[PDB]
Structure formats: structure tokens, C-alpha cells
User: Which sequence fits this backbone?
């Protein structure tokens, strides 16, 4: 069944901000925001456009004015966008995802007998479950919404009974939710708003498989919000897998991006002319690192560059250690300005003098892409060469660039938009 | 031992560095924690070092050799500074985890804590109950005078 | 293949009382009881404590602790 | 690297260092606070090996020490710390 996600009407005070004022507002809120077309933050409850019933509960809070994560997160969530909130306890983040949840639920048909929850909030612990549940019942009273908490360490049978009475909101720990679903105490068929809170803690406590299973069994066009106190590769990979074009919202003191240039060329063989026209200018800025995936391709490129007159090294995975150390040392001491390497062989290349990284052959995946361009220096740039056969990777690259507030050319976007799974799921 | 007045000032930088994408950041920050903890020993900075242990521990699941070698050295220095009791309390979680990888890592950490300070652990072991066939309670320690 | 790091880990596995991922509860607790008895025999006031609590002589308590070191916790499984 | 430690029971012989690696810890390679004197085993101090460097094997001109951190962690209580070359033979490098 269809449902709405976007309930947001931007306040004129926010629409009227100049670009500089917007930049300074996010600085004032100590927020770093990225992603495609993020909504502007607000600074007051009036900017959120909450009705009198919700404001009544908010005024009996415990809140004024909104917290920074609320200022930016509420417009993201009200706009129907997915979100990664990198923020700590208890920065008001729970209300940041609860208030829009209530609005989202209020738009839908009421629960019929047999209906599962409309919103699910997944938590690492019984303790957090109970706190979040308490907040859901407090604010949810504005609209007489029902919340049930199901967590490990709690009565399986009382939880089953509460789920059977019906609830718009289920707050849970992952394994216990999955258990009740398999037992048909509840079901996920009406879930359209899905929150993973303290996702880093959930991974640390062993729940990644359960988190992924829940995401896999909820409709893919859901709205999904993910919160973590830290960003680590595991959670970033998770976000790529279970979110669609999220807005990334980072509280400033908890965070602390490489310049990417993407060119779309005619075909694989035309990469050679591209490179020979540019390689001397690149070496004039510093050392140049070219990546390929396959040993054979590394070899062919390096041999062609040698015949071209370039002073370069080659690094592939079948090199012994001494062989390997010579090339890397030569590159470090700037004896050779150019190095061709495969991904598997590239350990040891965190070299400050690298001012150009070139993804000559496309990375296997976006994780590998990120690892590659991390070798770049600032003054340093990472070029990526695509051809029209790279449209799937292009979609992943667009999303990577957007999360890094890097330029997405029209050409690159058009290439990514060739595929329906991108072109639709696209926010 | 002069560094005992300056652990609180440095902890936020180390908290940022121990949660970082660059592996060299985490390796060098663990080196810092190790030298701090061994340099202040017997002066009472257990609060600061417990706080830092909370940030060192998530890095024990590290596949990189030099990084895991830095993390183990930081853990052995924190053993001296904090006590084998707190280390054993952190380690008892995964000794009998279902996952063989978790079991591998935790038994490495436990074997370090056991070879260093084997005799101090007699006071810190938890109480394990008798099953049908085997007696696991230590009764002399339950004697009352 | 001969490194210092793999020599350290192999010498750790030779120290009695050390375990691995296939160590059982029975083995772990037998190690605990054996070095508990050795430590009672080493520390003089713990032994004084036990000898006062159970109204025995210290030589008798030491002999009993020695006899209990051969099979603490009962026999193994399987 | 085919390098291990000797790790045999050390006796009354005292370890030496050449002038290159002179003030280092034979365990962690540090220069801060040499604390405890190094003992080696009787086999590693014999014949043509008498008085050679513990770390590299060159001619020794001073005594070898454990640093204060290694002493605190009780790293002086393992075996002989002489470095053994497994990739070669006795009269080799
Ligand atoms: Zn040392
Ligand atoms: Zn020796
Ligand atoms: Zn030497």
C-alpha cells in the first residue's frame, strides 16, 4: 500500500536565509551536513510547524528550544528523507526521530485487526528500549498513539499479548523483534518508518545480522533513520546498504573530504590518450599514483607508460617483499614520480608527496574506491575515469560524492540515472 | 611520572584519535596510552585510565599486524596501571562466546593477563556453581571466622 | 615463516594455566582450583585463617590441600 | 625476518652491546631509562661468541640493559634475550 513521507512545509524565515546565513546557522548549531539536497535546518519549534496537540506535550517537556540535532534532523525526517545522525546521548536525538514519526503515522489509515506497527525503533538494550518507549508514550499521547516495547530480558508472553492488542509503534531489541515476527505475534508488513538507534552499540553487542535481517524484511521504500555516536567503516557500509540517499548530520565535535574529479570517457582504450595528455602536468604537482585492479592491466599500463618515456614504477601482488620495498622506497624518495599499482598490492603508499591519485580502472566497489582515494594528499586530487559501461558503479559513486559534498557533474548523474534501481529509489 | 597532571588535558585528543579511519592514528594513540599508563603507576589516575580503556578496547578486533600489536601493548600497560581485576572483568565476556573469532581474540587477551599477574587472579575469579557431576565452588574462601 | 611474534605465542601456550578457543569450562576451573591451592600454601595468613576456621593443625591442612590437587572438581566428561 | 629470541635459562654471564646499538633496550629498542642488567645463557657466551653484541652480534664495548618499562612489566624475567638467526648457520652472519 502507498504511503506519504513528506509532511514538511519550510518556514518563510528559513526559506529567506541567504546562502551565507545558512552556512553560518549550521556553524552556530555546530553541525556538518552532507548528502543530496539537504533541507535547511530550523532554529525554533515554530519552524517545525507542529500542531497544538504535539506542542502541548512538548511544552510539558523538558524542551526549549530545540536542540541542534533536532533543528536539522526534524526537517530532514519531516521531508521524508533518510538520515544518518552522527550524535551522542542524549543530544535530543530521540525526540528528533520520535516527533516526525508521530506525524508520519498520523497520515495513515488506522490499525486494523492483524495490522503490525507502522513504525519500528530498534535499540541495543532493554534499558534504552524503556527510555525510548517512555518518550513515545509521552509524545504519542498527543495523537493517542500506542507504543509497545519488546526486548530481551523481558517476558516473552506478556510482550506477545501486548503486540496482539495492536500498536502503531514498536520499540525493540533486534533479536526479540525477529523472534516475535517469526512467531507471528506481530509482523512488519505495515512498517514504513524504521529507526536504528545507537547502531554502533548494536554492532558492538553482536547484532549486525539481526539489524540487517530486519532491514531486509521491511519494505524497501520505507523511510529509514540511523543514529550512531561514531562513524566507522562498518556503520558506513551498513548505511549504504539500508538507506537510500540519506542526509548525513554530524554534531561537530564528534567528527573532525578528498577533492574528487570524475570524467566520463568514450571507452576503456580512450583512457590512454586522456592520461598521456595530462600526466606531465600531474607530475608537476607531485607524485602520481595510478590504480588498476588486475595484474595484467597494471602490467600493460606500466609497460605503455615506460615506452612513452615516463619514469615510473610498478607494484603488483606477485612481487616478493624486497622487490616490493625497492619500488615503494623509490616512490617515497621521489626517484620515480609515477607508480602503477593494483589494489591488493598497495599497502605502504600513504605517501605525503602523492598529489594525484588516478582510478584508471574502476574499483570493484565503493569501499575500495574510498580506500584508493584516501592515499591522496591538501593540494591533492583524485581523478576517476568512467566509461558508459560503468553506470552501476556511477550510481554508487554519485552517492559517495554527495555524502562528501563533492561535485556531481550532469554527465555523471545522467550516467547513473540510466538504471531504474537508481533512478527510482533516488530520493 | 611528571605526566600525571596532564592526562585529563590530553584525553579528548586521544578519544578523537582512537576513533579514526586512519590506522596510523589508532596505532600511535595506543602507543601514547601505553606510555602514559606505564609512566603513571602508583599515583592514582585510575579514573582517567579507565575512561581511556573504554576507547582502547573496541580496537581489539583489528586484522592489521602493527595496529593489533600497538593495542596489545596498550592493554598490557593498562594492566599494570589499572589492575588485573578490571581487565578480567572486560575479558570474561567473550571467553565462551559462540563465535570462534571472538573466542580467539579474548583468549589472547586472557593469556596475556594470566602470564602477567597469575597470583593476583586468585582473588578476582567469579563464582561458578556446581553442576550435576562436577564441583566448582571454592569453599575455603566462604569460611567465616 | 619463523618470526619473533609466532615464537612468543607458542611460548605462551606452553605456560601451564593458559587456554585457547577450544578450552572447556572443566579445564579452566581445574586450573583455577590448582593455583588457588598453591597460593593458599604460599601465603601464610590465608593458611592461618583456614586452620583456625576448621580446627586443624597447619601441617594437616597442607597435606589435605596437596591431596586435593590431583583431582579437583571431579572427573572429566566423555 | 627469520629472527627469534634464544629464551633459554639465563645464567651469570652479562650481555654486551656494540657501539652502534649501545644505549638501547634489548627488547623494545628504546633509549629512555636503562634500568636492569641483562643476563644471557651459557651457550650464547662461549668461545668465539664471548663478548659479542646481543642485538646484532658485532664486537661489544658496553653492557646491555633493560629499560624501566620492561622492568616494570617484568620482561627481564623471560629467558636469554639474544637474537638468533634461523635463516643462516652458526659461522654465518
Ligand atoms: Zn624495553
Ligand atoms: Zn641464549
Ligand atoms: Zn650491535
Assistant:
Amino acid at each position: 500500500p502507498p504511503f506519504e513521507k513528506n509532511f514538511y512545509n519550510e518556514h518563510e524565515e528559513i526559506t529567506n536565509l541567504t546562502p551565507q546565513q545558512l552556512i553560518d546557522l549550521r556553524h552556530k548549531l555546530n553541525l556538518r551536513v552532507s548528502g543530496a539536497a539537504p533541507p535547511r535546518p530550523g532554529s525554533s519549534f515554530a519552524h517545525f510547524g507542529f500542531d497544538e496537540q504535539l506542542m502541548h506535550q512538548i511544552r510539558k517537556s523538558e524542551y526549549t528550544q530545540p536542540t541542534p540535532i533536532q533543528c536539522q534532523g526534524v526537517p530532514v525526517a519531516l521531508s521524508g528523507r533518510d538520515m544518518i545522525g552522527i550524535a551522542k546521548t542524549g543530544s535530543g536525538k530521540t525526540a528528533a526521530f520520535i516527533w516526525p514519526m508521530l506525524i508520519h503515522i498520523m497520515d495513515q489509515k488506522e490499525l486494523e485487526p492483524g495490522d503490525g506497527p507502522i513504525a519500528v525503533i530498534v535499540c541495543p538494550t532493554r534499558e534504552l528500549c524503556q527510555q525510548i518507549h517512555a518518550e513515545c508514550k509521552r509524545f504519542g499521547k498527543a495523537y493517542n498513539l500506542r507504543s509497545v516495547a519488546v526486548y530481551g530480558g523481558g517476558s516473552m508472553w506478556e510482550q506477545a499479548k501486548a503486540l496482539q492488542e495492536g500498536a502503531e509503534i514498536v520499540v525493540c531489541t533486534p533479536g526479540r523483534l525477529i523472534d516475535h515476527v517469526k512467531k507471528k505475534a506481530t509482523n512488519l508488513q505495515r512498517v514504513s518508518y524504521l529507526v536504528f538507534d545507537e547502531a554502533d552499540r548494536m554492532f558492538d553487542m553482536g547484532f549486525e545480522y539481526q539489524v540487517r535481517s530486519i532491514a531486509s524484511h521491511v519494505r524497501p521504500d520505507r523511510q529509514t533513520l540511523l543514529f550512531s555516536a561514531t562513524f566507522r567503516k562498518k556503520i558506513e557500509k551498513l548505511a549504504r546498504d539500508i538507506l537510500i540517499d540519506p542526509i548525513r548530520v554530524v554534531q561537530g565535535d564528534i567528527g573532525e573530504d578528498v577533492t574528487q574529479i570524475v570524467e566520463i570517457l568514450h571507452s576503456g582504450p580512450s583512457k590512454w590518450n586522456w592520461l598521456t595528455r595530462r600526466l606531465v602536468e600531474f607530475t608537476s604537482s607531485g607524485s602520481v599514483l595510478l590504480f588498476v585492479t588486475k595484474k595484467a592491466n597494471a602490467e600493460e599500463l606500466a609497460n605503455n607508460l615506460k615506452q612513452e618515456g615516463h619514469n615510473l614504477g610498478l607494484l603488483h601482488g606477485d612481487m616478493d617483499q624486497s622487490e616490493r620495498n625497492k619500488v615503494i622506497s623509490d616512490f617515497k624518495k621521489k626517484d620515480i614520480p609515477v607508480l602503477v599499482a593494483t589494489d591488493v598490492a598497495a599497502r605502504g603508499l600513504d605517501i605525503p608527496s602523492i598529489k594525484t591519485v588516478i582510478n584508471y580502472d574502476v574499483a570493484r566497489d565503493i569501499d575500495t574506491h574510498t580506500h584508493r582515494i584516501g592515499r591522496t594528499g591538501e593540494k591533492g586530487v583524485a581523478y576517476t575515469l568512467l566509461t558508459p559501461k560503468d553506470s552501476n558503479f556511477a550510481g554508487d559513486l554519485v552517492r559517495n560524492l554527495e555524502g562528501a559534498n563533492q561535485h556531481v557533474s550532469k554527465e555523471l548523474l545522467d550516467l547513473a540515472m540510466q538504471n531504474a534501481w537508481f533512478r527510482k529509489s533516488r530520493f | 611520572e611528571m605526566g600525571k597532571d596532564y592526562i585529563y588535558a590530553v584525553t579528548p585528543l586521544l578519544e578523537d584519535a582512537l576513533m579514526d579511519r586512519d590506522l596510523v592514528h589508532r596505532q600511535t594513540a595506543s602507543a601514547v596510552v601505553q606510555h602514559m599508563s606505564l609512566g603513571v603507576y602508583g599515583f592514582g589516575c585510575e579514573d582517567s585510565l579507565n575512561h581511556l580503556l573504554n576507547y582502547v578496547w573496541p580496537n581489539v578486533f583489528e586484522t592489521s599486524p602493527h595496529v593489533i600489536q600497538a593495542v596489545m601493548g596498550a592493554l598490557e600497560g593498562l594492566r599494570v596501571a589499572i589492575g588485573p581485576c578490571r581487565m578480567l572483568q572486560y575479558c570474561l565476556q567473550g571467553l565462551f562466546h559462540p563465535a570462534r573469532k571472538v573466542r580467539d581474540v579474548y583468549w589472547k587477551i586472557y593469556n596475556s593477563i594470566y602470564i602477567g599477574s597469575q597470583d593476583a587472579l586468585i582473588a578476582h575469579y567469579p563464582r561458578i556453581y556446581n553442576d550435576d557431576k562436577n564441583t566448582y565452588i571454592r569453599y575455603e574462601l566462604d569460611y567465616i571466622l | 615463516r619463523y618470526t619473533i611474534h609466532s615464537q612468543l605465542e607458542h611460548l605462551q601456550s606452553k605456560y601451564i594455566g593458559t587456554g585457547h578457543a577450544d578450552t572447556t569450562k572443566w579445564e579452566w576451573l581445574v586450573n583455577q582450583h590448582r593455583d588457588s591451592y598453591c597460593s593458599y600454601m604460599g601465603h601464610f595468613d590465608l593458611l592461618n585463617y583456614f586452620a583456625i576456621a576448621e580446627n586443624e593443625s597447619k601441617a594437616r591442612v597442607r597435606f589435605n590441600l596437596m591431596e586435593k590437587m590431583l583431582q579437583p572438581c571431579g572427573p572429566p566428561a566423555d | 625476518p627469520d629472527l627469534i629470541f634464544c629464551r633459554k635459562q639465563a645464567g651469570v654471564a652479562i650481555g654486551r652491546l656494540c657501539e652502534k646499538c649501545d644505549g638501547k633496550c634489548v627488547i623494545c629498542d628504546s633509549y629512555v631509562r636503562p634500568c636492569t642488567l641483562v643476563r644471557i645463557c651459557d651457550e650464547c657466551n662461549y668461545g668465539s661468541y664471548q663478548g659479542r653484541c646481543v642485538i646484532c652480534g658485532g664486537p661489544g664495548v658496553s653492557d646491555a640493559y633493560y629499560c624501566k618499562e620492561c622492568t616494570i612489566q617484568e620482561k627481564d624475567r623471560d629467558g636469554c634475550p639474544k637474537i638468533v638467526n634461523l635463516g643462516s648457520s652458526k659461522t654465518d652472519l
